[PDB]
Design a protein around this ligand. Structure first.
Ligand SMILES: CCCCCCCCCCCCCCCCCC(=O)OC[C@H](COP(=O)([O-])OCC(O)COP(=O)([O-])OC[C@@H](COC(=O)CCCCCCCCCCCCCCCCC)OC(=O)CCCCCCCCCCCCCCCCC)OC(=O)CCCCCCCCCCCCCCCCC
Ligand SMILES: CCCCCCCCCCCCCCCCCC(=O)OC[C@H](COP(=O)([O-])OCC(O)COP(=O)([O-])OC[C@@H](COC(=O)CCCCCCCCCCCCCCCCC)OC(=O)CCCCCCCCCCCCCCCCC)OC(=O)CCCCCCCCCCCCCCCCC
Ligand SMILES: COC1=C(OC)C(=O)C(C/C=C(/C)CC/C=C(\C)CC/C=C(\C)CC/C=C(\C)CC/C=C(\C)CC/C=C(\C)CC/C=C(/C)CC/C=C(\C)CC/C=C(\C)CCC=C(C)C)=C(C)C1=O
Ligand SMILES: CCCCCCCCCCCCCCCC(=O)OC[C@H](COP(=O)([O-])OCC[N+](C)(C)C)OC(=O)CCCCCCCCCCCCCCC
Ligand SMILES: CCCCCCCCCCCCCCCC(=O)OC[C@H](COP(=O)([O-])OCC[N+](C)(C)C)OC(=O)CCCCCCCCCCCCCCC
Ligand code: HEC
Ligand code: HEM
Ligand code: HEM
Lengths: 245, 122, 11, 66, 87, 60, 387
């Protein structure tokens, strides 16, 4: 359709995980998880990732247990009906800020913060689109005005996002010590969201190399064996002794 | 059902034949069945009763030559190659040798079919 | 009958 | 960091024709709106200029983002 | 067995339903005596070159025309729904 | 020795053929696993959780 | 007598795999039957395991698939392999159909084989459409809603068959249950039809590129054609393994990683890529019933090919006009798929209409005319040689 109603084509970058023999950047993964928890845990829900997933990837088991033991969950019936809260376990999912979709709609005007579990894989561009959307907030050009409750963002379809600028300068304190600019933080969040979309990337890319190597060797052997066996037919000689009456 | 061709109405008018000779030459060169040392009548389909009966009424020399030509052509097609330009089917040898027999068989069958359907119109 | 075709190329 | 480099690429000689078109926009469209007409929106030129600037700037900054 | 089957055009070994052959001598060697990878590259290169030079345009023309109209259609459709296209 | 002894040992009877096939497969699996492990470990330097451990948690 | 020629089961195996007379010069384009059979076997075997973790309910279908993907041991392999094998099935089906069409394998003695293949193709299309609706994705739900409404074109009992199939008033739990059951059932019927396909073909043998009889130089299947298939098997394995290990969702549209929201209306509603040309054909006709009729005819016209091909020879190895027009038609098919993929904008609808007109003209006007012209030209040249 019209360029205004379809958005601006995303920019292209290079990520460590886009190569043929490269995994993730786990330090960036941990920093992105920290930024997620300290920023977008307030409204965006990630109710498809458990605390046990982060064990051995971004956190140790003791760290995961200690961090999860601070969230209060709701458990099954007591000895006489009732429902009693729990200090949290290592087998629960991350807490959703809202109890249902209608509460989310009521809180944020009329919008609905989408779940972030599988958003990177479900958008036309993935990491590039998400990063450009995060870093692409600019003042509107002359002639186009934004009504109250909307923001100008060229990368969004229609150039009308319902969000506000989520990542300002120095919003989080990184444990490693890197400065928290709007560029570094967005990159780390994009990396963490991509990991949350496909947590199985490393094992898949590790198996594929050996599979491809063995299959290539087998094909190279087959191409020779066929030529070996099909030899006495491709090199026949036919002579015609004319049958004189 | 059967192959069809406007190969006689054009022959009725000499001017059309004179105009269409070069195009036919180019088309027959482009077909490339002569590059395999074959003749045109070899390629005709033989799976019905008429052609099966016709192939059993050829002279023995023609049948043997056809068998050798087909076998050599398939042997060449095995290795994806063609004969040198010297051993190509010359135009003089590329004559129609199966059409008259098929025509005779079709005429016999048509005569029997005609006798089959009859009526009495007093 | 002809002579044996030369197969020495493929041997 | 990204904003400064994008602005520098905007003023860089690499993207100057789209900037010229955007300037002619700004002048004409501002005159039109302050006259009292709301019918024209050349967001396309802003798209072109921003795409040029981002393509110029992003690879430079992305390398030192560690 | 029997069962008096129908009529086909294949038969089996021994009686393949073909015309009688005569005077067709055939020689072949043993796979253990011949040499694979002998003359493969030369013959394959010549065959590929001949096939490219012979068939060639038969595939070249329609695909090229289709690609040209594809590119023209994409360009024109992008232009028309833009600002200046609608006017 | 020569080349007839090799044929006499493994490639003489089918029973002495399948056993060689299976043993060679068993060894080849281990060889390929070691190769891919080494190449993947060499590919990623300073990019896995084991080599970023001291930076984050050792400082507590 | 050999045991393989005596025991009835071993005799059945031998007559079809060990000692079967075959043409001695069939090219590498005759290797796709075994590829299709192996792909079907892989699909069935993998689907049997995939059915062990799937809950067929509209409210609980997406979470089950996600649990398969990220919780079961090596479940991602199962999901990606099933999807990519289902995709490769149609590539090999199109290659098989193209091979059959180009070399004229539809003009007797093998015409029952062609009809059985056409029926198998129809059943495969239906099975794929049923299967891809299961994961309850956004395009799955919306495309199911769009496609299932096509049954309303029936004059009398129309708009009632749609409700009977839906099992209600919209796509809900009963629809998913029925679709799961039918998708489970159909592949076995497809396998039986393929067995009948092979049985029908066996009674007359296969063709050859030259188009002439091959009852003079025949060789047995093994080991001459049991090894030529291994190379293609391994190449296809390489392709599918790369596609499943380095880019699993590479054939998949970006609007398929979201739960089905029955209020969110997608910008473009399109089926998968292998069914795209028929969707392009359907949207071309302004009328509704005419569109459905044309879409069905686009697949049912393959049965009429034997009775409108007036050629004195079989195949296209010695017919330049066919060589030109076949590739032109293939390009038209690709362009039709491309047009079906994109938006229905200004120039695109005109291009699609032109492509549909050419596609429906190819099977009615072009073929008899050029075959007759070739016959006439060859006969005219042959009739003036000695003169
Ligand atoms: C989408 C699909 C589109 C196409 C669909 C149809 C394609 C069919 C699939 C093709 C696969 C079969 C094939 O051609 O290759 C089999 C082919 C055997 O078939 P063949 O009996 O020779 O008959 C085919 C001839 O090419 C006879 O043909 P020709 O004489 O006209 O020659 C044509 C020639 C083309 O000519 C050339 O390219 C010049 C020669 C350079 C060779 C290029 C590759 C090496 O073709 C080749 O020789 C190609 C070689 C490999 C093909 C690559 C497969 C990619 C599949 C495409 C998808 O394999 C080889 O020739 C391989 C040779 C070397 C292997 C042995 C290695 C040594 C031992 C390994 C030790 C290591 C431990
Ligand atoms: C120079 C030095 C080095 C050069 C190297 C260049 C790089 C190439 C690397 C080689 C890798 C390929 C593998 C290889 O060579 O072996 C495979 C193959 C070995 O051949 P073969 O095993 O002896 O059997 C084929 C015969 O040679 C038969 O050959 P022919 O003499 O009869 O030639 C006829 C050829 C015409 O020649 C060409 O077109 C070739 C021209 C360029 C050659 C390739 C370069 C790219 O067309 C065909 O082969 C017939 C096509 C069969 C029809 C089935 C496919 C149709 C698809 C259906 C589409 C959708 C259907 C809609 C259904 C509707 C349902 C609703 O090599 C070929 O020559 C393949 C030709 C296939 C053409 C594909 C066109 C794609 C463009
Ligand atoms: C010229 O033409 C030719 C071709 O082309 C060249 C060909 O194509 C072919 C055709 C050749 C064929 C391959 C024939 C078939 C091909 C077709 C014609 C079409 C395709 C046909 C098919 C559909 C193939 C048939 C496959 C079927 C029916 C389904 C297969 C299903 C499975 C294999 C099961 C899957 C496995 C699962 C899900 C679980 C398995 C069970 C377990 C063991 C799991 C573990 C459970 C336990 C541990 C439980 C405890 C176990 C017990 C009790 C045992 C303990 C031990 C005790 C002793 C008690 C021919 C003949 C031909 O001439
Ligand atoms: C029946 C359905 C259609 C078929 C479906 C495909 C079935 C694939 C499995 C069987 C493949 C082999 C079929 C039988 C071939 C055979 O005859 O085996 C014997 C050959 C040796 O036979 P030879 O080549 O003539 O040499 C003579 C050797 N002397 C006697 C001198 C000692 O020795 C060999 O061939 C050994 C190599 C092959 C043996 C199997 C080992 C590799 C496969 C392991 C299992 C993985 C397969 C799982 C997936 C199928
Ligand atoms: C693979 C791991 C190592 C596994 C290692 C253990 C596997 C078991 C070892 C033996 C397997 C084979 C069993 C039969 C052995 C045998 O000696 O059979 C000989 C005959 C040969 O047949 P014939 O000599 O040509 O004809 C005879 C007809 N008369 C003269 C009697 C009228 O009968 C024939 O063979 C006819 C050939 C066709 C019938 C046999 C087909 C199946 C053979 C394999 C069966 C076992 C497969 C097991 C697969 C797990
Ligand atoms: C002000 C509350 C709020 C904040 C803080 C917030 N989000 Fe959003 N987000 C929303 C809402 C509401 C929408 C829906 C916007 C719309 O549909 O127009 C949204 C939309 C999105 C989308 C969907 C974009 C699309 O095209 O569908 C993504 C991705 C996203 N936000 C990421 C983030 C990230 C990353 C952060 C942390 C840097 C963040 N959000 C912080 C509330 C928030
Ligand atoms: C016994 C045979 C089969 C069974 C039991 C089976 C079962 C299933 C199941 C349970 C799913 C759901 C996937 C999921 O939940 O993630 C599925 C998906 C699918 N199936 Fe099958 N199937 C079979 C054969 C086939 C065949 C023969 C085809 C095509 C010719 C096919 C094509 C598909 C497709 C396209 C999908 C959707 C792809 C996706 O979910 O990403 N299946 N099948
Ligand atoms: C979908 C459309 C199909 C059509 C139109 C079709 C038609 C045909 C025709 C006409 C032939 C003979 C060609 C010749 O002799 O020159 C053939 C061969 C064959 N078909 Fe099919 N068929 C189809 C699908 C299938 C399927 C699904 C399978 C197996 C699951 C299959 C298996 C085979 C086999 C094994 C052969 C013989 C070997 C070969 O040609 O590769 N076919 N088919």
């Amino acid at each position: 359709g019209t360029p205004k109603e379809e958005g601006l084509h995303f920019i292209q970058h290079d990520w460590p995980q886009s190569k043929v023999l490269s995994g993730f950047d786990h330090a960036s993964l941990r920093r992105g998880f920290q930024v997620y928890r300290e920023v977008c845990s307030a409204c965006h829900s990630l109710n498809l990732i458990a605390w046990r997933h982060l064990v051995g990837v971004t956190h140790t088991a003791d760290e995961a247990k200690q961090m999860a033991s601070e969230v209060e969950y709701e458990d099954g019936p007591d000895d006489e009906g009732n429902m009693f809260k729990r200090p949290g376990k290592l087998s629960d999912f991350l807490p959703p800020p809202y109890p249902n979709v209608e509460a989310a709609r009521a809180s944020n005007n009329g919008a609905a913060p989408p779940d972030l579990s599988c958003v990177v894989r479900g958008r036309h561009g993935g990491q590039d689109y998400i990063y450009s959307l995060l870093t692409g907030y600019t003042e509107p050009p002359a002639g186009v005005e934004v009504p109250d409750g909307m923001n100008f963002n060229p990368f969004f379809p229609g150039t009308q996002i319902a969000m506000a600028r989520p990542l300002f300068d120095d919003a989080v304190e990184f444990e490693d010590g890197t400065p928290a600019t709007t560029a570094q933080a967005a990159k780390d969040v994009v990396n963490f969201l991509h990991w949350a979309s496909e947590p199985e990337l490393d094992i898949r890319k590790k198996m594929g190399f050996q599979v491809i190597t063995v299959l290539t060797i087998l094909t190279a052997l087959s191409m020779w064996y066929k030529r070996f066996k099909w030899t006495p037919i491709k090199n026949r000689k036919i002579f015609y002794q004319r049958p004189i009456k | 059902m059967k192959p069809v061709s406007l190969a006689k109405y054009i022959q009725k008018s000499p001017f059309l034949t004179k105009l269409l000779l070069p195009i036919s030459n180019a088309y027959v060169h482009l077909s490339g069945y002569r590059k395999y040392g074959l003749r045109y009548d070899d390629l005709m389909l033989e799976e019905n009763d008429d052609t099966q009966k016709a192939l059993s009424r050829l002279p023995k020399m023609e049948s043997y030559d056809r068998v050798y030509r087909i076998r050599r052509a398939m042997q060449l097609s095995i290795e994806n190659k063609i004969l040198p330009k010297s051993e190509w089917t010359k135009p003089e040898e590329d004559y129609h040798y199966l059409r008259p027999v098929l025509a005779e068989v079709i005429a016999e069958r048509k005569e029997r079919e005609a006798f089959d359907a009859l009526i009495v119109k007093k | 009958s002809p002579e044996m075709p030369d197969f020495s190329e493929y041997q | 960091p990204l904003e400064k480099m994008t602005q520098e690429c905007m003023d860089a000689p690499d993207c100057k024709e789209v900037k010229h078109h955007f300037e002619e926009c700004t002048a004409r469209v501002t005159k039109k709106v302050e006259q009292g007409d709301k019918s024209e929106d050349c967001i396309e030129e802003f798209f072109h200029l921003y795409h040029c600037a981002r393509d110029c700037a992003d690879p430079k900054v992305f390398k030192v983002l560690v | 067995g029997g069962a008096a089957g129908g009529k086909t055009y294949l038969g089996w070994w021994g009686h393949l339903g073909g015309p009688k052959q005569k005077g067709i001598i055939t020689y072949s060697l043993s796979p253990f005596q011949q040499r694979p990878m002998a003359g493969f590259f030369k013959t394959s290169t010549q065959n590929m070159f001949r096939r490219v030079m012979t068939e060639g345009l038969y595939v070249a023309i329609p695909f090229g025309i289709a690609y040209y109209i594809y590119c023209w259609g994409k360009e024109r459709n992008e232009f028309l729904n833009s600002k200046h296209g609608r006017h | 020795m020569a080349s007839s002894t090799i044929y006499n040992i493994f490639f003489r009877r089918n029973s002495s053929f399948y056993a060689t096939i299976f043993v060679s497969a068993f060894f080849a699996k281990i060889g390929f696993d070691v190769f891919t492990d080494s190449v993947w470990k060499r590919a990623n330097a300073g990019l896995t959780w084991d080599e970023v451990k001291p930076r984050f948690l050792n400082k507590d | 007598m050999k045991i393989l020629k005596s025991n009835p089961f071993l005799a059945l195996a031998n007559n079809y795999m060990i000692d079967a007379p075959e043409p001695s010069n069939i090219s590498y384009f005759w290797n796709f039957g075994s590829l299709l059979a192996c792909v079907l076997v892989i699909q069935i075997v993998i689907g049997i395991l995939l059915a062990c973790f799937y809950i067929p309910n509209m409210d609980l279908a997406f979470l089950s698939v996600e649990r398969i993907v990220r919780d079961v041991n090596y479940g991602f392999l199962l999901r990606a392999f099933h999807a990519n094998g289902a995709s490769f099935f149609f590539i090999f089906l199109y290659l098989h159909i193209g091979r059959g069409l180009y070399y004229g394998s539809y003009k007797y003695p093998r015409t029952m084989t062609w009809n059985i293949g056409v029926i198998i193709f129809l059943l495969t299309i239906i099975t794929a459409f049923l299967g891809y609706c299961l994961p309850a994705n956004q395009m799955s739900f919306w495309g199911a809603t769009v496609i299932t409404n096509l049954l309303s074109a029936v004059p009398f009992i129309g708009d009632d068959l749609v409700h009977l199939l839906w099992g209600g008033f919209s796509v809900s739990n009963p629809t998913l249950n029925r679709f799961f059951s039918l998708h489970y059932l159909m592949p076995f019927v497809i396998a039986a039809l393929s067995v009948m396909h092979l049985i029908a073909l066996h009674t007359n043998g296969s063709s050859n590129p030259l188009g002439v009889t091959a009852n003079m130089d025949r060789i047995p299947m093994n080991p001459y054609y049991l090894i030529k298939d291994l190379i293609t098997i391994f190449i296809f394995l390489i392709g599918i393994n790369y596609m499943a290990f380095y880019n699993p969702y590479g054939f998949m549209e970006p609007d398929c990683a979201l739960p089905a929201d029955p209020l969110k209306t997608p910008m473009s509603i399109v089926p998968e890529w292998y069914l795209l040309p028929f969707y392009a054909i359907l949207r071309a006709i302004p009328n509704f019933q005419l569109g459905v009729i044309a879409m069905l005819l686009s697949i049912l016209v393959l049965l009429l090919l034997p009775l409108l091909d007036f050629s004195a020879i079989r195949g296209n190895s010695f017919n330049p006009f066919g060589k030109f027009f076949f590739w032109t038609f293939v390009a038209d098919f690709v362009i039709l798929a491309w047009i079906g993929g994109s938006h229905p904008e200004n120039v695109f609808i005109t291009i699609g209409a032109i492509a549909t007109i050419f596609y429906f003209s190819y099977f009615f006007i072009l073929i008899p005319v050029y075959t007759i012209l070739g016959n006439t030209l060859i006969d005219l040249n042959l009739s003036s040689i000695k003169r």
